[PDB]
Amino acid sequence: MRPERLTVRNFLGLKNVDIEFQSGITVVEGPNGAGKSSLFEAISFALFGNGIRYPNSYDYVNRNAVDGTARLVFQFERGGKRYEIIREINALQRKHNAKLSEILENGKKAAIAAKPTSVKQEVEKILGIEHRTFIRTVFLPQGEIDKLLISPPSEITEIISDVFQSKETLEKLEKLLKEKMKKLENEKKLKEMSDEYNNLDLLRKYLFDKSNFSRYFTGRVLEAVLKRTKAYLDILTNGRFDIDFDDEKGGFIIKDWGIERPARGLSGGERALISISLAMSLAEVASGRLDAFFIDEGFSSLDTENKEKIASVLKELERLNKVIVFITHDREFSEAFDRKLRITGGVVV
């Protein structure tokens, strides 16, 4: 979606921040351990209700404020009609409130959900993105992005696996199906049992085998992700880079001017642009078009001189018009982005 506004108070890592997302690419930075990582957590908790750091909702209250509630509002366009959501949560009171009021053209908010459980259902119903997927989509951790790029084919099919579906759910379906077969094998009626066993066991085998469904599913990403990755590498690179995928080779084989080339050979800013592009392509082929992205700096030890160069080459992302915000930790990356946002000591300076 397009995050327009996000007023956070006493949310973990934050005390009182007021952010207004604007067209282009913003970059938030502050003293390590506060504001930067925590700010996004807040946005992902305003939608459904479950962040990504803690399981229990109440744990998301700032340590600096005890017995105090944490309020956070959030406006966001999605489908041509902007919505607004404000949840509050107090550890002491043991009570959590919320409300998904949509903002009308008239300027008056309309009710859609009262309980936090209702706001979750409604939000997930908007653009068919469950919290599980949302966490693995709009938030792109630089470390995992760059890794996906120069990843092997086996580790790649894995990445694609645990982004469209929970590994746990698959294992549970596994065990349940195996249990049903054990039940059948142990036990007119006998013919119906043999029909059920064979049919349930066959489906099992179809879903279970990596060679078939698992193989096809991976294709969608290569046939869909690449399809879209190419377009990104064109609008950002002026038709210079064009990548594809191949098992025979390492995996994501990348071509520069029709000529393939090792991804390690590329400069940092190229690894970044190309990697981020593929990443948004995967994120979007899984969750539809996205109008925003959160990327945090990875600060690989040998990546410092590049930090200033990478900043210049990534600036091309602004051409996509998406709301792209960087969650950098180092000042050198933070500097070369006209639009800056520093968060010191929980507050914004």
Added chain:
Amino acid sequence: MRPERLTVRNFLGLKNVDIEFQSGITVVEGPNGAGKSSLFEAISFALFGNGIRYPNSYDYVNRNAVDGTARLVFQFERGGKRYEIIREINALQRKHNAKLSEILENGKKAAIAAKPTSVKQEVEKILGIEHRTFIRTVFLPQGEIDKLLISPPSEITEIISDVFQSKETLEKLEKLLKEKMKKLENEKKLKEMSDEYNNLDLLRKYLFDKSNFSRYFTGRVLEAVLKRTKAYLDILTNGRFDIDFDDEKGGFIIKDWGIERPARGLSGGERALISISLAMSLAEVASGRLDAFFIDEGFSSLDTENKEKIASVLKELERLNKVIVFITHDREFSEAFDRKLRITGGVVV
């Protein structure tokens, strides 16, 4: 002829002059009334013994010297063999001497005549030029030359008449012939008388009729003088001026570059060159080729500025190689001729 030397002493207008003629034009000038006009008279006298100014030989003695003789020698080439003549004449003594001694290759003079009457006969026998013609030939008076040029046809035929023959002789032949006829008319024998009358009277008429012979003679002047005049106007004018004569129009037709033009239109130096050329042509058609000429300045009142210009244009006459001497009276004409000869007070300075 080619006068080489002329030593005059006590000859009228002169006291003691020694002249040595040289190739090209020669100009002699001095105080008016002496040397200039008289010098030439002397040269005419040395040959024949008559001169021009006076009839009686003795009158040619200088006034400044009385009871004294006048001696004059004269060398002159004529026919490839140079001659020398020295006459002396004393008024008091009443005796005149002469001698025509020819100069040999050896350097020794040979006798040809002793008496002045003998030297005259011998000289006239050389180149068949009688004193009568010589006076009207080698001596060209500028006044008469220029006049002959722009002369009418009647006055022209006259000029040609009294240059090839004495008018007096013609008149005398006239009267004698008329007397014979009167004799016959007044008086076998009668038949012989009638035959003589008719025949003598017819010849008479042939001579007399200006209509017939006198006319043909005039033709001789046209056919031959022009013939030679053209050549002179070519060697001196570089083929610029051509002269022909037509009786009806009046004067001598003059053409400049094939285009006729009034002679009055020409500059002084052109009138001079053209006129002198025609003059030498007449003089030579009457007396054969001449290797010398005497011309004296006419000093027409309006001719002064021209005097200096005419001098420059007449200098072309030097190209003929003839011994041409000018007897100028004014200094301006005298100056622009490299070769000068001044005669002051009878002597040469």
Added chain:
Amino acid sequence: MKILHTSDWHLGVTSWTSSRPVDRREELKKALDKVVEEAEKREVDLILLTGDLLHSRNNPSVVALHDLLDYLKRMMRTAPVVVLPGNHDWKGLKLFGNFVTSISSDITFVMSFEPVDVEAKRGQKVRILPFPYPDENEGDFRFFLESRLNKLYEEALKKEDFAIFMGHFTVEREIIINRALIPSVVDYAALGHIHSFREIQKQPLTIYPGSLIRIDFGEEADEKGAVFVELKRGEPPRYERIDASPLPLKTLYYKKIDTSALKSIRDFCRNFPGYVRVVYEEDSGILPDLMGEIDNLVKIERKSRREIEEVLRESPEEFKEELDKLDYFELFKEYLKKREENHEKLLKILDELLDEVKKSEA
């Protein structure tokens, strides 16, 4: 009758003299060769020449003239050629051409707005309607041009078999001409003076054949070659395009020349048969002598971010548009249903297993 038409040639044209001079003559001959060879193999009846046949219109090199006359002969060997030289071309080429016209039937230089009646290889009576650059004040010029068209029209109607219009101008100093102004009664309108091929209209069939070699990078995306038109009485005009095969061009665009950029340029130029031009925006050195090293790197420029985006054009297909997002199981639901005779049943037991796991989770 069959007609092979070739646009401007630009013989003896030296490309990129400001950066790295390249003698196109070799390439230009090879393309002409291929074109002429196609004309012979196709046994055309008439050959048309228009536009700038010589590159230099004020001082053609001797060799350039040699080549022109050379190919004029090769051309005539196959079929009668008609040349319409534009006024831009040098004058001794007009007096010359006129002289040859008179001593031959296999060639004809049209150089006046007055029509000429040529005769094709197979004897077809073609009438040429010429409209060259008016040789030897703007409102009267347009009036003058419009009048000539009225003239060409009247003279076009009086045709015998075919009537081909030939023109040297720029379809709407240059001469602008409205398409409507061109005679409609002509069987074909051969134009020239434009490097890039452009089929103006189909009635009457108006074509710019364009050059046979990419003269500059402003036309790296062009197909180069002649056009083989075919006029028949009973049926409408039809025309193919003959590909020249001339060396290709490629522009490499960079944000800034750096160690990576350099390697990219080197790697590309090394495997590229044509000529390369690198363009960049951000200041980048201090650049090494690429031309000195890379012998086929003809030009290095610096387009502004505004200009590099304008010239690039738009390629928005399959972008910024909605993408069919598919979930893992609904794709499973789909893969199974397509790949088995009876799916509905497996589909039903699946949703039941899903319901069972969902419930046993909350």
Added chain:
Amino acid sequence: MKILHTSDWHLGVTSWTSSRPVDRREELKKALDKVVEEAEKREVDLILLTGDLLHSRNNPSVVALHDLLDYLKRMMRTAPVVVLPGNHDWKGLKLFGNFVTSISSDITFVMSFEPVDVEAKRGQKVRILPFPYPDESEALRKNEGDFRFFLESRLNKLYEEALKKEDFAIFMGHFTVEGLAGYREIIINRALIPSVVDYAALGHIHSFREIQKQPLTIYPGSLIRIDFGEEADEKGAVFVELKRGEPPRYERIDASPLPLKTLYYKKIDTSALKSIRDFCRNFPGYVRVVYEEDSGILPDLMGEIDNLVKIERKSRREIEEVLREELDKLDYFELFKEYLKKREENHEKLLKILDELLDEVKKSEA
């Protein structure tokens, strides 16, 4: 067969550019016209062009080229023309001519020492023995030995190829025959020219000159008087006629181009001025006045007299160089005797009586 031979034209030649520029083109066309017209009326079989057809060999004007090709066509309309261009190398003109040669029978540019076999209007088989200026560079070292030996070698070659003729064999050459007034040039001995040729058409010399009668060698010369150095020349082409049974015969066709006249003066003065004015006013051609002694200051005759192209100053020595007797004396009495001898039946009868009268006047005087 009948042949019209023409010598260098100098098309688009501007005369006297240093004093008063005159565009000869008009006049030059009129002469060419008269020449071509005579060629047609005479129904010639072959037309030969040699020498300098274009005035400027490094940069011919467009018009000059236009005129040349114009008359080349008019020429071909009457009979096949063969052009031998000499020492001329502009804009690959030689290249032009070569191209047309190949596409036509009515014209043939010979531009190599190698013989070519043309064919006349009436079908006569003419073999051209060419000898142009030489292409490429011989070099300084080869000219003294290479240059004469090379020329000799060419002639030996043309000879051998001349013997192998069919009907007629015409030699064509662009050079200066040794023994002329001299006006780098190529000197060639007359003996060196092939004797077996039926005619040797030369060029490159403004003034007409019949070198020899065997083989008939001719310089036609220009059609207009290009400068005053040729005011005494007749200008025009030459119409030669070769037959098998009989020896060559040739007329001269008078072009009749404007005439020139040099007026020579000793000094320009009031009379001179009137003379110049009077002459130029009645002279259809161009005039040059030359003088020696200075008459300056001089009036602007050129500004007044529009046909006074040049005013020069030749030394008395030079004016005489460029410009390239006893007289009988007769006495009056002799002329008289002569007259009485032709204008009457019997002369002597009158002379006897006349001598008696002369004797009587002589005696009665001394």
